[PDB]
Amino acid sequence: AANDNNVEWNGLFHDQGPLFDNAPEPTSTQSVTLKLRTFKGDITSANIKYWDTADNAFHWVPMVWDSNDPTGTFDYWKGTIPASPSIKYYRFQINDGTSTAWYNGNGPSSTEPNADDFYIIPNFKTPDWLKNGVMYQIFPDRFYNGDSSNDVQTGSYTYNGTPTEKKAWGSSVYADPGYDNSLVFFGGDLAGIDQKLGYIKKTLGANILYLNPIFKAPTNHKYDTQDYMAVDPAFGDNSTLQTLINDIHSTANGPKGYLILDGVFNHTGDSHPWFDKYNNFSSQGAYESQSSPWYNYYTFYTWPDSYASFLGFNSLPKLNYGNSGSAVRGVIYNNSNSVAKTYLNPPYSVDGWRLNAAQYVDANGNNGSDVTNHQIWSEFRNAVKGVNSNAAIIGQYWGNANPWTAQGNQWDAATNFDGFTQPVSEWITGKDYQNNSASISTTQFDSWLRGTRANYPTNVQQSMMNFLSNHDITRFATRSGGDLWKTYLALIFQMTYVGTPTIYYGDEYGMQGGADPDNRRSFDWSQATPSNSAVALTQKLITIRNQYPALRTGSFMTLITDDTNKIYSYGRFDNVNRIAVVLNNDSVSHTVNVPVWQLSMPNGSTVTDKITGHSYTVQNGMVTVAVDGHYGAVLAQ
Numbered sequence: 001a002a003n004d005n006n007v008e009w010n011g012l013f014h015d016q017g018p019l020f021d022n023a024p025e026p027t028s029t030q031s032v033t034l035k036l037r038t039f040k041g042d043i044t045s046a047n048i049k050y051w052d053t054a055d056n057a058f059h060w061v062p063m064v065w066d067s068n069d070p071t072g073t074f075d076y077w078k079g080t081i082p083a084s085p086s087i088k089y090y091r092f093q094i095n096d097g098t099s100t101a102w103y104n105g106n107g108p109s110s111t112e113p114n115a116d117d118f119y120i121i122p123n124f125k126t127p128d129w130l131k132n133g134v135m136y137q138i139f140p141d142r143f144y145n146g147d148s149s150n151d152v153q154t155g156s157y158t159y160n161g162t163p164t165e166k167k168a169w170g171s172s173v174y175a176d177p178g179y180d181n182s183l184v185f186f187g188g189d190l191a192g193i194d195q196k197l198g199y200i201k202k203t204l205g206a207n208i209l210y211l212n213p214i215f216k217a218p219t220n221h222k223y224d225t226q227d228y229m230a231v232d233p234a235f236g237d238n239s240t241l242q243t244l245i246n247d248i249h250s251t252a253n254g255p256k257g258y259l260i261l262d263g264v265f266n267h268t269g270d271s272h273p274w275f276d277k278y279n280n281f282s283s284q285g286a287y288e289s290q291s292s293p294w295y296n297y298y299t300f301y302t303w304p305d306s307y308a309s310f311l312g313f314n315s316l317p318k319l320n321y322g323n324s325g326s327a328v329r330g331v332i333y334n335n336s337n338s339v340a341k342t343y344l345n346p347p348y349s350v351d352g353w354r355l356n357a358a359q360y361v362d363a364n365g366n367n368g369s370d371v372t373n374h375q376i377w378s379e380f381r382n383a384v385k386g387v388n389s390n391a392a393i394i395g396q397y398w399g400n401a402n403p404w405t406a407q408g409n410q411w412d413a414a415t416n417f418d419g420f421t422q423p424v425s426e427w428i429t430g431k432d433y434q435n436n437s438a439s440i441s442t443t444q445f446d447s448w449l450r451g452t453r454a455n456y457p458t459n460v461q462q463s464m465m466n467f468l469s470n471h472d473i474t475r476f477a478t479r480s481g482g483d484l485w486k487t488y489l490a491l492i493f494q495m496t497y498v499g500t501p502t503i504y505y506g507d508e509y510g511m512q513g514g515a516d517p518d519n520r521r522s523f524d525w526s527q528a529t530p531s532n533s534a535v536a537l538t539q540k541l542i543t544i545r546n547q548y549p550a551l552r553t554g555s556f557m558t559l560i561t562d563d564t565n566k567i568y569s570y571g572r573f574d575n576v577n578r579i580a581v582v583l584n585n586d587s588v589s590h591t592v593n594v595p596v597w598q599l600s601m602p603n604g605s606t607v608t609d610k611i612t613g614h615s616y617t618v619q620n621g622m623v624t625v626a627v628d629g630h631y632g633a634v635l636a637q
């Protein structure tokens, strides 16, 4: 490269990883110094062009030459953006003589982009344990029956005109004739989860647990809350919860863990004392008397049998959050003994909340996705962070969650359906997460992944809940048609991508299952050992990610997108480690020349595939490795 009226795109690069941004999570007064990489001597000038919400205008900040990388192949230019609490967006204008190129969240462009700019959100920090950990989601009733005395028995109670049923372990999740799918209980409880912490934290290595609802409710999924202040008797009691949390936080049964609970705050069950539709409790619920102490907690259109609810589900009356200072905002997150604060405070001290139906939370029965909804989550974040600045907040959302994250005042991240689950599914299994046929090439996969990452600030990207499957969609192994290797590949990608790897109980061994409720089968424990090849791989991959900070908070650079041979390679790197991941999708084995020079891996240095143990030597900026179909190598140094 040289000063020849031409900017060479191949040498350009910038993202907010350690080597290019000294303040990825800036405080309200923090200056942000950035570095732009280019081929050595390729440009004549560079500017950071940023939009400031403070004064509704663009601002140009020149860059100055800073240095060359260890291989002497690139230049590093640096610039500093003035500090202030205002949100800012930036892109780069790179010039060489009369030639100009632009660069933003989606890479290089010949024309100045109008979107996908990078983010600078002052005073927005997500928990670092979330960025660096591995999550394991458990649907309580289906994991492990640690206490048989609390098991819900068949016919114990009837709800919606149907009795409950107890199911034998390993039998179909579908209710037998006469029962309802939502009232089927296998017996899984909190004692069981505690007893299997060694399997989760030691055998596998995950250190973050995310549990579906566990508070008093009549259903087996428990999203129809009856009492937020107590564990459902079938799962145990509050003391059992205190012990489980203590055991999760313990280091005696594996590494220190973290607990994230499911917060169902958009609505309650119709059997909740506040509502009490079936007249089961003393007090006069909102449904029973217009003179109820909790009448304002809900929204009726025609009292008492016509009220706002979750998507028309009668058993799910919608909570009216009213305006700031309301009684509902008090019981949920403003009061000293609010639900959110209660569990974040001792003797519980949980580590976070997953926000159920977070997009609908509103006042007066509104559908959410509006100013009020965003205002409520702003107050919620302020409260939660006040109690514990390291308490996680992850909202449920299926599309682009930018509105609840990019403002830096609401959620730390979201259920990554749009930026992880869907693309991963369509690339590997060739189905959408609902199991309808839908496929994408490797280049489209890389593009999808980058475009969605660009929807979020860097810390949010690193905090996204990335799961292959969950309780509302079909199982990955079912979408894969039982092809376990597809799970192998998915795991390798997952454990090396941006965002929190999240294992939905069972996926580690290849558990199958169709749509709800078949996606909530009882866990087959005879499969929980290295004998299951997927379990053995999972254990190894978690150890690798726990080992390299670069895989959790390092930069991400696309290296190879080959649709002919189905090869996808990308680098994850920071100031210490450089990692080139090489994946092979749906094709026979291939020998790949990995361009590690793009990662500045020096010629003559050695790299080691952390999966196989094979070592290689960098020659002429390359590493030549063989990767079989539906597998991958993790070349690191």
Ligand SMILES: OC[C@H]1O[C@H](OC[C@H]2O[C@H](O[C@H]3[C@H](O)[C@@H](O)[C@@H](O[C@H]4[C@H](O)[C@@H](O)[C@@H](OC[C@H]5O[C@H](O[C@H]6[C@H](O)[C@@H](O)[C@@H](O)O[C@@H]6CO)[C@H](O)[C@@H](O)[C@@H]5O)O[C@@H]4CO)O[C@@H]3CO)[C@H](O)[C@@H](O)[C@@H]2O)[C@H](O)[C@@H](O)[C@@H]1O
Pocket (backbone or CB within 6 Å): 160, 180, 181, 182, 221, 223, 224, 310, 313, 314, 315, 316, 356, 357, 358, 396, 397, 398, 471, 472, 473, 516, 517
């Ligand atoms: O009253 C008649 C009827 O009553 C009973 O229930 C019938 C319904 O039961 C089941 O649905 C349950 C579900 O099993 C529960 O888990 C619970 O659902 C909650 C989710 O689990 C949470 O993640 C959260 O989801 C909110 C999201 O909801 C929507 O997403 C849906 C997708 O669109 C869809 O493709 C698929 O993936 O499902 C999801 C979730 O349902 C919404 O679009 C999205 O924006 C939002 O984020 O909250 C949920 C509610 O708390 O409750 C459900 C309702 O009770 C069956 O799955 C359902 O088919 C059935 O209608 C009796 O069981 C039944 O016999 C009787 O006829």
Ligand SMILES: [Ca+2]
Pocket (backbone or CB within 6 Å): 001, 002, 003, 004, 005, 006, 007, 008, 041, 042, 043, 096
């Ligand atoms: Ca040039």
Ligand SMILES: [Ca+2]
Pocket (backbone or CB within 6 Å): 145, 146, 147, 148, 149, 150, 151, 187, 188, 189, 234
């Ligand atoms: Ca039990």
Ligand SMILES: [Ca+2]
Pocket (backbone or CB within 6 Å): 276, 279, 280, 281, 282, 283, 284, 285, 288
């Ligand atoms: Ca009553």
